[PDB]
Design a protein around this ligand. Structure first.
Ligand SMILES: [Cl-]
Ligand SMILES: [Cl-]
Ligand SMILES: [Cl-]
Ligand SMILES: [Cl-]
Ligand SMILES: [Cl-]
Ligand SMILES: [Cl-]
Ligand SMILES: [Cl-]
Lengths: 148, 147
């Protein structure tokens, strides 16, 4: 009679896409191509939260990382790839419940650290991360060049 | 006539000495990390030597198969670290060290060469530009404990 978290199945790709496009606006086929791979992967977790009326109101994606993640001292570590809750549902703390499901899952992979990141100019994401129990570790500038 | 060479198991001394300046830590920690690196196919570590066979620069790099911020390809080469003695920077040995990674990376089927730096290390940012890198993203990292 409230909210409910579940790992995403192929049957729920549309509900996943609808929220995923709000988080990361992009071409539908790019999303779907990625979504279909992720659900076959053991090192990936993707969840949806539903209401009574079967409305998908939140999603989370996470991974297990074996390469060095900034701010960490162990490997592997869990990593938050994306989380999105509809505004009307933020005060419900379903985001806390989603995060907690990753930790149970990450514990299976012998992880003791759960990392994430956010754009430097997105302070709201910084406030959200702290509200979920994350603390800041490092601020980083990324560079790259083409290899000719 | 500076010479750039991959680091052998008998050059830990020169490597350690430059590696300690770049990342101050304790010797036995460095050393056992260094010994592991040498055997790894996805890793490259170089030293630059002068005429007098004085070690004046070092570089470490890796191939990354997991997502690196700012890139759109996988895998990518990644600059793990680079140090040139202050006195030898004006010689552009850092440039010659980067080039050796690219050749190595090309031959690993990479097309992008990524790196990062602490936000408060503007000198590194100036150095990355000097080496031909351009900025892709600025990012804050977070963490919480599980067990
Ligand atoms: Cl798999
Ligand atoms: Cl359903
Ligand atoms: Cl959210
Ligand atoms: Cl980002
Ligand atoms: Cl190997
Ligand atoms: Cl330098
Ligand atoms: Cl860093």
């Amino acid at each position: 009679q409230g909210m409910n978290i579940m790992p995403i199945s192929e049957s729920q790709l549309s509900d996943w896409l609808a929220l995923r496009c709000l988080l990361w606006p992009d071409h539908e086929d790019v999303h779907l191509q990625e979504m279909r791979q992720l659900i076959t992967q053991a090192h990936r977790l993707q969840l949806l939260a539903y209401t009574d009326t079967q409305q998908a109101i939140a999603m989370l994606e996470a991974s297990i990382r074996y390469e060095y993640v900034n701010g960490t001292q162990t490997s592997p570590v869990a990593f938050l790839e994306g989380i999105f809750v509809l505004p009307e549902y933020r005060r419900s703390g379903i985001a806390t419940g989603l995060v907690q499901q990753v930790e149970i899952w990450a514990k299976q992979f012998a992880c003791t650290e759960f990392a994430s990141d956010a754009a430097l100019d997105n302070q709201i994401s910084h406030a959200m991360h702290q509200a979920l129990g994350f603390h800041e570790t490092e601020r980083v500038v990324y560079f790259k060049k083409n290899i000719g």
